[PDB]
A paper describes a structure:
The icosahedral capsid contains 60 copies of a protomeric unit composed of four proteins, VP1-4. Enteroviruses are unique in harbouring a lipid molecule (pocket factor) within a pocket in the VP1 β-barrel, which lies below the surface of a deep depression encircling each fivefold axis, termed the canyon. Here, we have determined three cryo-EM structures following mixing of CV-A10 Kowalik strain with KRM1: the CV-A10 mature virus, a disassembly intermediate A-particle and the mature virus in complex with KRM1.
Of the three bands visible on the gradient, the material used in the cryo-EM analysis was derived exclusively from the lower band. As expected, the structure of CV-A10 Kowalik maintains the typical enterovirus architecture and surface topography but a signature of CV-A10 viruses is an extended VP1 BC loop that, together with the absence of helical structure in the VP1 GH loop, widens the front part of the canyon whilst the extended VP2 EF loop is bent inwards narrowing the rear of the canyon and the VP3 C-terminus protrudes into the base of the canyon. This contributes to a distinct electrostatic surface potential compared to HFMD viruses from other receptor sub-groups. A distinguishing feature of this strain is ordered density allowing the whole of a 13-residue long helix at the N-terminal end of VP1 to be built. This structure lies underneath the VP2 helices that abut at the twofold axes, in a similar position to, but eight residues longer than, the corresponding helix found in EV-A71 and CV-A16. Internally, the N-terminal portion of VP4 is disordered in CV-A10 Kowalik, but residues 18–28 are observed to cross to an adjacent biological protomer in strain SJZ10-1740T/HeB/CHN/201014. Disordered RNA density is visible within the particle, the outer portion rather closely packed against the inside of the capsid.
Numbering used by the authors:
A (entry chain D), G (entry chain D): 28 to 68
B (entry chain B): 10 to 255
C (entry chain C), E (entry chain C): 1 to 240
D (entry chain A): 2 to 297
F (entry chain A): 51 to 149
H (entry chain C): 1 to 48
I (entry chain A): 150 to 199
J (entry chain C): 145 to 192
The structure:
């Protein structure tokens, strides 16, 4: 319910804080998905 | 079943018997610039078979006391093939790449290479001069080596101040002479603009560092070469005019 | 006008305040955003990535050899190969990894960690190692009959040249501070030691000196608390 | 139809599925109980770092764990709340004395001058955000004195002031802030003003074409999409007010988006725009110990 | 009263702020408005209008002759007639047109442009020209075999004495700044050159010297970014 | 010669692609063009012992300073509401509690 | 949803911003509409 | 801006006032509470 | 005046104009000596539960 | 560096000791004659 006193969007304070993680693009950026409990090779 | 692999692009193919994986950089495939992100109004050109193929650079001999090499992209492919000609005739260039580095060795040699990509691999001048008018800056041939590729002077800092330890956050892959013999990386177009020039700004750089130095017993093969091959994928060019080499 | 009252806290500038500010350019429309791959939303995506560990941080070990722990054919069994403390906020090996350089920007850390050990020896050279993480208490063990009592994993060489020991979250408090020393050692996390399980057996005409690459990272239950100014950078004058 | 190698790929070159879907993670991950498993062929500990993928061996798969409804928070780790704290950016020195007959000071907007915030905002390669600027202004001794000041923003292209009372200070179009030295710091909000789609702190390339030297390559890496103009400051007066003045600038990064993370710098800084260092004094990231098997 | 707190930014005067102000005359009713033709609502209506281009801005070309590029019967073929850079923010020909004097009030511009070439020669005199806009790269071409590679249009004389070459929006960034020089040439837009396609053929008893009027304007996708103080006016003292 | 400007757009001259142009045009409207305050006039009140006047007078005329005159003279007929702001300092730029 | 604290309309801030263009009165102020792809004369 | 008027009592610091204060750490999540026996809510439990 | 909060671990200032005062991450309060007292709110920051 | 431009395949040794490069049918005419030499080299097929 935060508010902005000016008509410009870049004057607001913390418009939206988000909880969105996606580590599988840095930790597992591979082609064929390796299983967690199988042998890699 | 997973060690064997075959890549095929255009009129070229690459086999491999011991490499086990395909690192897709940042989990995104190379794609064409969608209309919702394009800024140039002209129509680009998309050969897709004349340029999309595996160009094999020269080979670098891994010595017992080597220090590592780096290449710039698409700097390497600016004088070879139809890719070179398109990049010399067009102003706006966009493309992803598929890297493949091979360094085979017998089951008695030992060593490990780190093969990584550094988006915007800005090099640094090695010198303690703090005034910006006398400070040392890397020459043009040291920052855009070309097809030959350049060597490092102190790889522990990647010639860019940053340490090599954390460089593993980048799309990377090891070449461990006990398990695999080649590493491959599919990297998309990484840039803050839809298109960009191909002779001024190099999107990223390739890094090959011998972390675990080459070691072998007497009698084995001493000439252990490293070969890199590159395939530009989903390439587009725009802004046609006379040929400008640089 | 409307009756108001000014309270303590007026005219102050709290550098971490979350408030509005008058724009300079009215009716502004920035440059539209495009799709740039590799967007990061939270630093916990960075702590999960493996980064090499300067575990051979001794003098007379200059250069890239700091990232390599040596391995050689030992004539004496039950012998120690390497050791290091598992406190990322502490100075030492963890000071080089990413989790250890980003855990210094915050004060308190929580969650498990993991350490991957990749063998860079020859293919014909085999061996076994014992990686033992010992929770706090006395100093590092003397013999491995004492280290086997802590959390540990026995790593076999061969194909799949990398094992990964997970340092669990064994603590009293929900969080540990990054600072150690003095009476802050109450927040110590223990020591992880790598012992020769059996040996480094190697056939003829194969080097008897190999190396092991230690990489560190945070587990999936890693979390951080109040921000903090890092202590890894120093500046005297402005960068002109 | 007549030639179909051209249609077979046109209708096959759509958006290729690159599934890496994330989920909304409110709190840190808990754990599930695990007993002992004596099974062959299923090894979660054996990994392969050569695949470029990090180990996925979690706790439950390695040791016998209990279950814990982890209620710890992860909100203070998001980059929004990581860059939401203002820090020093630049300081100007306005010596409006009798010997310094200039009257105005000028500051090229460049946040790469102070390491504290540079080290943070350089761990990411491409950043897009809105800034919140705050100007504190004191004397050389730290005193406040009722003298009115004018801060003008000179975008790239506008004429920079040439004197204390030159015409450029009319600010008919340039945004400007008039504030007294004995008032709260002046705070404004600035949007994402780059011509590109994101600020880049590392630009591996040159701005222009042409032949590039090898001795003094002073133009390498300098991207123009970063330079965002100039900041001029004066004291509103016709004659000189004899005082030494010092204006500090703090910037907060809100509505932040970062891209392509980067290793955090280890060697000290030497230049503002360039990432120079010295090969003679390479400061290793890890402090030295006595022996390797002697963890302190 | 109501508890409040003053934040940083009080008592400041931001010249571009968008706020209310106490009126001086309460209960005021201004003079009613009437219909005055020719109302303009946005400056993009002004950028679309063609205005002449001082393309002959050489020394020893004083007066109105700056608005005229000469054309004459050339004995040598493939010859260059005129050239100029297509950067409105740059100093030069565009500095005279309207789009070029109003693009200086803003910092960044985007969108295509157009250049109309009106022939003011005799009626019996014919000819052909080649108008070639070359995107950035090297300097202007040397011969027209090099210029033909860029964007271009071949203009035939006769009835409908004016052709219009549209300079498309060929760039990397969504916006280009008005400032050039130094490392701002990264925002250069290229050069447009007018070459003699075939010749300027003329019958007897007709002047062999004609002129061409170059006019410039912005296309329909022209847009502008942050305001800015122009640099085309100078004042020393008050106008008393 | 028809007095009309050329209408040759891009699609009709060269082969173009399609682009969902998302650029903004709001900062080009005259509202947001004149929405920025600028200097108009400056008065000099020398209330000293030698100047026994005590008051200053200024004929309201914004045509005295070129910066804003050059803008508001590109249009011939203008109708608007003004928002005036008076800063007042000494000759040195000091503030002193005088009403 | 902008607001004015005084009962006088000329004290508001930016009451209404509008997107209304009409270039065809400066660019094509002619009697008979010229087509975009035909010859003018 | 909105017309206001400052009343007597401004800029004072009443040590027993019940008001808000700007936080220093935005987006903060403290250490979760556990069950500690022997919670006291009012001093009248102590007087008995 | 400038009040800086130095959590356990951060480098403590070493001089009047040292670099630690840049407070790029540390919370800080800038306030004049002739202003109302500076007031902030601090949460339960212990690593323990109490 | 000149040969890599044609059709090619990179053969790795190890298990499956035989690779097979397929020389595609890249020609102008539907057929090539068996005779070469002289002005019959117009029917040449290239070099591997
Ligand atoms: C009257 C108000 C004056 C203060 C406002 C000045 C405008 C601020 C523009 C900031 C531009 C984005 C932040 C700057 C980023 C980096 O400094 C540049 N990319 C180069 O270092
Ligand atoms: C007590 C308040 C004093 C300040 C208010 C004074 C009244 C301002 C009237 C402004 C009239 C419209 C703006 C003036 C326009 C031009 O100066 C004139 N048309 C002639 O130059």
């Amino acid at each position: 319910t935060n508010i902005n006193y000016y008509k410009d969007s870049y004057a607001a304070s913390a418009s939206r804080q988000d909880f969105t993680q996606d580590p599988k693009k840095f930790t597992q950026p591979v082609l064929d998905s390796i299983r967690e409990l199988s042998a890699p090779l | 079943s997973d060690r064997v692999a075959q890549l095929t692009v255009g009129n070229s193919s690459i086999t491999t018997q011991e490499a086990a994986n395909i690192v897709l950089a940042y989990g995104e495939w190379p794609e064409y610039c969608p209309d919702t992100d394009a800024t140039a109004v002209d129509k680009p050109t998309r050969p897709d078979v004349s340029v999309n193929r595996f160009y094999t650079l020269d080979s670098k001999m891994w010595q017992e006391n080597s220090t590592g090499w780096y290449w710039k992209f698409p700097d390497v492919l600016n004088k070879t093939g139809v890719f070179g000609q398109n990049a010399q005739f067009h102003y706006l260039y966009r493309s992803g790449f598929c890297l493949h580095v091979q360094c085979n060795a017998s089951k008695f040699h030992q060593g490990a290479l780190l093969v990584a990509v550094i988006p915007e691999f800005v090099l640094a001048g090695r010198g303690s001069n703090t005034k910006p008018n006398e400070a040392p800056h890397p020459g043009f041939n040291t920052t855009f080596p070309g097809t030959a590729g350049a060597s490092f002077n102190d790889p522990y800092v990647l010639d860019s101040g940053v340490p090599l330890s954390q460089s593993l956050i980048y799309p990377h892959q090891w070449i461990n002479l006990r398990t695999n013999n080649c590493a491959t990386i599919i990297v998309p177009y990484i840039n803050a603009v839809p298109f960009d020039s191909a002779i001024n700004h190099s999107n990223f750089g390739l890094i090959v560092v011998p972390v675990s130095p080459l070691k072998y017993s007497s009698g084995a093969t001493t000439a252990i070469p490293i070969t890199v091959t590159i395939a530009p994928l989903n390439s587009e060019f725009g802004g046609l005019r006379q040929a400008v080499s640089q | 006008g409307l009756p108001t009252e000014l309270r303590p806290g007026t005219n102050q500038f709290l550098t971490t305040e979350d408030d509005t500010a008058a724009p300079i350019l009215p009716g502004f429309s920035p440059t539209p955003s495009i799709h740039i791959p590799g967007e990061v939303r939270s630093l916990l995506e960075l702590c999960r990535v493996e980064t090499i560990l300067e575990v051979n941080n001794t003098t007379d070990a200059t250069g890239l050899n700091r990232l390599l722990i040596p391995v050689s054919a030992q004539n004496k069994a039950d012998e120690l190969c390497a050791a290091f403390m598992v406190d990322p906020g502490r100075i030492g090996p963890w000071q080089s990894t990413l989790v250890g350089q980003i855990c210094r920007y915050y004060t308190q850390w929580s969650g498990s960690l993991k350490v991957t050990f990749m063998f860079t020896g020859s293919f014909m050279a085999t061996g076994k190692m014992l990686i033992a993480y010992s929770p706090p208490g006395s100093a590092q063990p003397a013999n491995r009959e004492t280290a086997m009592l802590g959390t540990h994993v026995i790593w076999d060489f061969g194909l799949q040249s990398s094992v990964s020991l997970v340092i669990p979250w064994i603590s009293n408090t929900h969080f540990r501070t990054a600072k150690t020393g003095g009476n802050y050692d109450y927040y110590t996390a223990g020591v992880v030691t790598l012992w020769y399980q059996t040996n480094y057996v190697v056939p003829p005409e194969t080097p008897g000196e190999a190396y092991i690459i230690a990489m560190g990272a945070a587990q999936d239950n890693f979390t951080l608390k109040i921000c903090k100014d890092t202590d890894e950078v120093t500046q005297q004058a402005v960068l002109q | 139809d007549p030639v179909e190698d051209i249609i077979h790929d046109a209708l096959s070159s759509t958006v290729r599925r690159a599934i890496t879907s994330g989920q909304d993670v409110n709190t840190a991950a808990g754990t599930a109980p695990s007993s002992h498993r004596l099974e062959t062929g299923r090894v979660p500990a054996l990994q392969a770092a050569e695949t470029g993928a990090t180990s996925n061996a979690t706790d439950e798969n390695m040791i016998e764990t209990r279950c814990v409804m982890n209620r710890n928070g992860v909100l203070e780790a998001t980059i929004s709340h990581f860059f939401s704290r203002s820090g020093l950016v630049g300081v100007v020195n306005l010596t409006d004395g009798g010997t310094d007959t200039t009257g105005y000071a000028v500051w090229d907007i460049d946040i790469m001058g102070f390491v504290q915030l540079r080290r943070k905002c350089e761990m990411f390669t491409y950043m897009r955000f809105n800034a919140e600027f705050t100007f504190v202004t004191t004397t050389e001794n730290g005193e406040a004195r009722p003298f009115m000041l004018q801060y003008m923003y000179v975008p790239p292209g506008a004429p920079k002031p040439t004197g204390r009372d030159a015409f450029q200070w009319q600010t008919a179009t340039n945004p400007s802030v008039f504030v007294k030295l004995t008032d709260p710091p002046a705070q404004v909000s600035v949007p994402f003003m780059s011509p590109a789609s994101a600020y880049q702190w590392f630009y591996d390339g040159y701005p222009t074409f042409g032949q590039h030297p090898e001795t003094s390559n002073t133009t390498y890496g300098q991207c123009p999409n970063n330079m965002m103009g100039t900041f001029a400051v004066r004291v509103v007066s016709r004659v000189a007010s004899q005082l030494k003045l010092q204006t500090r600038v703090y910037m907060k990064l809100k509505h932040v988006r970062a891209w392509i993370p980067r290793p955090i710098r280890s060697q000290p800084y030497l230049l503002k725009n360039f990432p120079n260092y010295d090969s003679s004094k390479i400061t290793y990231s890890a402090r030295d110990r006595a022996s390797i098997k002697q963890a302190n």
